[PDB]
PDB file of C-alpha atoms and ligand atoms in Angstrom:
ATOM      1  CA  UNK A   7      -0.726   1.778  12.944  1.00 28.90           C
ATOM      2  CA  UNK A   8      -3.358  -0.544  11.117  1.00 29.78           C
ATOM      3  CA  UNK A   9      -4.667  -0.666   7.687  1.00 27.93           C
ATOM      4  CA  UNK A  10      -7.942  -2.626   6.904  1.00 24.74           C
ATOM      5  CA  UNK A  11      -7.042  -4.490  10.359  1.00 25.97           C
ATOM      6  CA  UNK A  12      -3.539  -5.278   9.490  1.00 25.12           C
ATOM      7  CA  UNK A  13      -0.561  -3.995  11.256  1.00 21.23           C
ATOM      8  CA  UNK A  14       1.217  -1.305   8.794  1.00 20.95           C
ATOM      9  CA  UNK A  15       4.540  -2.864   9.351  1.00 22.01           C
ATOM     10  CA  UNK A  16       3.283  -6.353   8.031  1.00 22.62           C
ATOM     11  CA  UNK A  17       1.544  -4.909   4.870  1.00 23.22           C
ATOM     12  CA  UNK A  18       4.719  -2.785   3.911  1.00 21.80           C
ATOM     13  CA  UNK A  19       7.140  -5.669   4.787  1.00 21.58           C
ATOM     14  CA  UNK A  20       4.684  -8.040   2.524  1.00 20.91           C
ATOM     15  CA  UNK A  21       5.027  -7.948  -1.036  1.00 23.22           C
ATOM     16  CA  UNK A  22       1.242  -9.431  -1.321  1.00 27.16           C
ATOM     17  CA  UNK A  23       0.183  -7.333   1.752  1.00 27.23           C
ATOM     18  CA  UNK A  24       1.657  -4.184  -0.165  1.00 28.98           C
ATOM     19  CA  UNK A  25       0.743  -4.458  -3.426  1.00 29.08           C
ATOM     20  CA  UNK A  26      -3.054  -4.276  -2.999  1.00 27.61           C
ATOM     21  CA  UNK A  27      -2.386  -0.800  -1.670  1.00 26.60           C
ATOM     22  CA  UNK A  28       0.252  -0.167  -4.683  1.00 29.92           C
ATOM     23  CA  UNK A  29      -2.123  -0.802  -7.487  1.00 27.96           C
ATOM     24  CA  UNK A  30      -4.932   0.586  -5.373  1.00 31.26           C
ATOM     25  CA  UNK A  31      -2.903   4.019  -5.269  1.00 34.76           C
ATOM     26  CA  UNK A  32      -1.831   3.118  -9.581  1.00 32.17           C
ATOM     27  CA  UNK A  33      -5.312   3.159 -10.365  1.00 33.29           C
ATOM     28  CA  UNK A  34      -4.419  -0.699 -10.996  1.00 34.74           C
ATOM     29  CA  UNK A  35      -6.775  -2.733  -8.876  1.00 37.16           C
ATOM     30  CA  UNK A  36      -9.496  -2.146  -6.249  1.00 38.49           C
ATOM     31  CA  UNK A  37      -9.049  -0.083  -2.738  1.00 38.79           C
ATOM     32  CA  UNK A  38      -9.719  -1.473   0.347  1.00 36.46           C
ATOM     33  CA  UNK A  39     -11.363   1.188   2.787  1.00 35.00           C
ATOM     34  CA  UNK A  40      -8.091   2.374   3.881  1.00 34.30           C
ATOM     35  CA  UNK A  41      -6.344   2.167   0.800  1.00 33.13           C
ATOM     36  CA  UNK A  42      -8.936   4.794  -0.969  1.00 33.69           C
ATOM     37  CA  UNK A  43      -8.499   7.124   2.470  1.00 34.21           C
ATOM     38  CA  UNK A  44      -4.433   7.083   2.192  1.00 39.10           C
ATOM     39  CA  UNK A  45      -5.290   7.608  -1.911  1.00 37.87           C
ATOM     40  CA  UNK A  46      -7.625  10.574  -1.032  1.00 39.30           C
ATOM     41  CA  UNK A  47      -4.911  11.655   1.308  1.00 37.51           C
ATOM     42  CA  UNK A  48      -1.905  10.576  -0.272  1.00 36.64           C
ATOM     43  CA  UNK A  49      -1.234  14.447  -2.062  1.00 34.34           C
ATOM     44  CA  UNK A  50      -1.520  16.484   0.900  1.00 37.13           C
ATOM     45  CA  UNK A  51       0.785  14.182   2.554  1.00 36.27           C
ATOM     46  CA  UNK A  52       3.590  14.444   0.154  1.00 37.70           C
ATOM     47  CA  UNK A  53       3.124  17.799  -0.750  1.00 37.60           C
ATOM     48  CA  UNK A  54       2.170  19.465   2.450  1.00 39.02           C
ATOM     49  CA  UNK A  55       3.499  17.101   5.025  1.00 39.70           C
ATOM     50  CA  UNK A  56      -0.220  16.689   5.634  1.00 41.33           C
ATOM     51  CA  UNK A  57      -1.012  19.746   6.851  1.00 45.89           C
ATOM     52  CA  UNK A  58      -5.106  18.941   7.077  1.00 44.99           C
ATOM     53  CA  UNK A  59      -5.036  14.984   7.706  1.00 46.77           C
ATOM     54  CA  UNK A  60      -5.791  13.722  11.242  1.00 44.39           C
ATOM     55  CA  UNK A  61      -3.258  12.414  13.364  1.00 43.87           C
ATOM     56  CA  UNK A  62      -4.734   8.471  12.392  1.00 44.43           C
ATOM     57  CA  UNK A  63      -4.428   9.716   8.571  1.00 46.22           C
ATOM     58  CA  UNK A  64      -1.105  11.428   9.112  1.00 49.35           C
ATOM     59  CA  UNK A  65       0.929   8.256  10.890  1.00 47.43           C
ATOM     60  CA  UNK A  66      -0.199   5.821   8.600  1.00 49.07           C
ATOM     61  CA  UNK A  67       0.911   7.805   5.321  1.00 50.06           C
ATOM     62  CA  UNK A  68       4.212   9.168   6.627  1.00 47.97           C
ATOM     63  CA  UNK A  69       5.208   5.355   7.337  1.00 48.30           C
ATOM     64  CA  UNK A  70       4.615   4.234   4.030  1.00 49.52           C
ATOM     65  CA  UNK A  71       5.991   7.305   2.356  1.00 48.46           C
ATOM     66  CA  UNK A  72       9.090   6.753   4.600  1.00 43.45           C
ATOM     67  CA  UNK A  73       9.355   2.685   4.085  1.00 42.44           C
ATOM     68  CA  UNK A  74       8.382   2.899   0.273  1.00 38.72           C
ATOM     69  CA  UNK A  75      11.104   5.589   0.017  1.00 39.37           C
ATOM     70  CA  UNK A  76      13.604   3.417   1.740  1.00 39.92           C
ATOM     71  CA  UNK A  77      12.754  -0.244   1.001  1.00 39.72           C
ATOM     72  CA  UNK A  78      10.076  -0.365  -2.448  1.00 38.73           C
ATOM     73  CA  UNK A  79      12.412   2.265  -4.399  1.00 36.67           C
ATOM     74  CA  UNK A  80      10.460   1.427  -7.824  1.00 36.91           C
ATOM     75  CA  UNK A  81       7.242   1.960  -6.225  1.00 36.00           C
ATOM     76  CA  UNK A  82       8.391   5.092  -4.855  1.00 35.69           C
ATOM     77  CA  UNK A  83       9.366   6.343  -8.009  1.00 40.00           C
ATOM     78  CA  UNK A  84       5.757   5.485  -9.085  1.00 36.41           C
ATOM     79  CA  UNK A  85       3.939   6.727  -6.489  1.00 35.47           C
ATOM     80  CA  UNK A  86       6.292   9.623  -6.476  1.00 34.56           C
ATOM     81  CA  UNK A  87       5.794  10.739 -10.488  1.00 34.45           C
ATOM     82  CA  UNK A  88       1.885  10.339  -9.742  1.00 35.45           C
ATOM     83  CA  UNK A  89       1.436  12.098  -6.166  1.00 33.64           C
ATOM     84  CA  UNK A  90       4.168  14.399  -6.113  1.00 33.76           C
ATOM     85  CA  UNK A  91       5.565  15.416  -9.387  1.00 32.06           C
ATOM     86  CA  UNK A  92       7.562  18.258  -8.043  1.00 33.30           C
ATOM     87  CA  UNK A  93       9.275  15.955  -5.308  1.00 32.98           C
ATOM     88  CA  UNK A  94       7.978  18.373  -2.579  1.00 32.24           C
ATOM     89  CA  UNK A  95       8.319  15.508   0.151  1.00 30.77           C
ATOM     90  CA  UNK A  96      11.740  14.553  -0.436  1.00 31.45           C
ATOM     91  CA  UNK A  97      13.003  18.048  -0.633  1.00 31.13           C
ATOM     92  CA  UNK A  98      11.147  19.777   2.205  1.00 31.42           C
ATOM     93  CA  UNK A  99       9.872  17.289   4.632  1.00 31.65           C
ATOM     94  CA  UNK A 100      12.027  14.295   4.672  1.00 30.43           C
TER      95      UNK A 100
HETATM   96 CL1   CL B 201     -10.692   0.189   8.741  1.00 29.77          CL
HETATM   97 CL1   CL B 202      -7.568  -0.625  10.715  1.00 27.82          CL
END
Protein backbone atom coordinates (compact mmCIF):
# COMPACT_ATOMS: atom_id res chain seq x y z
CA UNK A 1 0.00 0.00 0.00
CA UNK A 2 3.20 2.30 0.33
CA UNK A 3 5.66 3.56 -2.09
CA UNK A 4 9.07 4.99 -0.86
CA UNK A 5 7.06 5.41 2.60
CA UNK A 6 4.14 7.15 1.16
CA UNK A 7 0.68 5.87 1.15
CA UNK A 8 -0.19 4.83 -2.67
CA UNK A 9 -3.43 6.64 -2.52
CA UNK A 10 -1.65 10.04 -1.66
CA UNK A 11 1.06 9.71 -4.43
CA UNK A 12 -1.64 8.84 -7.16
CA UNK A 13 -4.10 11.52 -5.86
CA UNK A 14 -0.90 14.08 -5.93
CA UNK A 15 0.06 15.53 -9.06
CA UNK A 16 3.75 16.22 -7.47
CA UNK A 17 3.55 12.89 -5.52
CA UNK A 18 2.74 11.16 -9.01
CA UNK A 19 4.78 12.56 -11.33
CA UNK A 20 8.16 11.48 -9.90
CA UNK A 21 6.92 7.97 -10.56
CA UNK A 22 5.53 9.16 -14.18
CA UNK A 23 8.78 10.41 -15.51
CA UNK A 24 10.58 7.75 -13.51
CA UNK A 25 8.52 5.05 -15.60
CA UNK A 26 9.11 7.83 -19.13
CA UNK A 27 12.63 7.43 -18.74
CA UNK A 28 12.18 11.30 -17.80
CA UNK A 29 13.69 11.78 -14.38
CA UNK A 30 15.25 9.65 -11.62
CA UNK A 31 13.49 6.46 -9.75
CA UNK A 32 13.05 6.30 -6.33
CA UNK A 33 13.60 2.61 -4.99
CA UNK A 34 10.11 1.74 -5.61
CA UNK A 35 9.60 3.53 -8.63
CA UNK A 36 12.56 1.41 -10.51
CA UNK A 37 10.82 -1.99 -8.82
CA UNK A 38 7.13 -1.04 -10.27
CA UNK A 39 9.39 0.01 -13.69
CA UNK A 40 11.13 -3.45 -13.58
CA UNK A 41 7.72 -4.84 -12.94
CA UNK A 42 5.53 -2.65 -14.69
CA UNK A 43 5.40 -5.23 -18.15
CA UNK A 44 4.52 -8.31 -16.51
CA UNK A 45 1.86 -6.49 -14.78
CA UNK A 46 0.10 -5.19 -17.77
CA UNK A 47 0.74 -7.90 -19.90
CA UNK A 48 0.40 -10.88 -17.69
CA UNK A 49 -1.67 -9.57 -14.87
CA UNK A 50 1.59 -10.18 -13.03
CA UNK A 51 1.77 -13.56 -13.15
CA UNK A 52 5.53 -13.74 -11.35
CA UNK A 53 5.39 -10.46 -9.05
CA UNK A 54 4.87 -10.93 -5.29
CA UNK A 55 1.79 -10.14 -3.69
CA UNK A 56 3.67 -6.52 -2.27
CA UNK A 57 4.72 -6.00 -6.13
CA UNK A 58 1.36 -7.10 -7.46
CA UNK A 59 -1.05 -4.60 -5.16
CA UNK A 60 0.92 -1.71 -5.63
CA UNK A 61 0.99 -1.92 -9.61
CA UNK A 62 -2.61 -3.02 -10.15
CA UNK A 63 -3.64 0.28 -8.13
CA UNK A 64 -1.85 2.52 -10.21
CA UNK A 65 -2.65 0.74 -13.42
CA UNK A 66 -6.33 0.92 -12.24
CA UNK A 67 -6.23 4.80 -10.91
CA UNK A 68 -3.96 5.99 -13.90
CA UNK A 69 -6.50 4.23 -16.17
CA UNK A 70 -9.37 5.95 -14.50
CA UNK A 71 -8.17 9.34 -13.21
CA UNK A 72 -4.42 10.34 -15.22
CA UNK A 73 -6.00 9.26 -18.76
CA UNK A 74 -2.91 11.03 -20.65
CA UNK A 75 -0.51 9.26 -18.57
CA UNK A 76 -2.20 6.14 -19.19
CA UNK A 77 -2.02 6.51 -22.70
CA UNK A 78 1.77 7.01 -22.11
CA UNK A 79 2.48 4.48 -19.94
CA UNK A 80 0.17 2.36 -21.96
CA UNK A 81 2.04 2.91 -25.68
CA UNK A 82 5.42 2.19 -23.67
CA UNK A 83 4.48 -0.93 -21.34
CA UNK A 84 1.83 -2.46 -23.17
CA UNK A 85 1.67 -1.75 -26.80
CA UNK A 86 -0.79 -4.44 -27.57
CA UNK A 87 -3.28 -3.18 -24.76
CA UNK A 88 -3.15 -6.71 -23.18
CA UNK A 89 -4.34 -5.21 -19.70
CA UNK A 90 -7.28 -3.45 -20.80
CA UNK A 91 -8.52 -6.23 -22.94
CA UNK A 92 -7.88 -9.30 -20.78
CA UNK A 93 -7.48 -8.33 -17.23
CA UNK A 94 -9.38 -5.25 -16.50
CL1 LIG B 1 10.86 1.19 0.25
CL1 LIG C 1 7.27 1.71 1.31
Amino acid sequence: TKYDGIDLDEILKSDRLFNNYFKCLMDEGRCTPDGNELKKILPEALQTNCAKCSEKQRSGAIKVINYVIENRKEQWDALQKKYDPENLYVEKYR
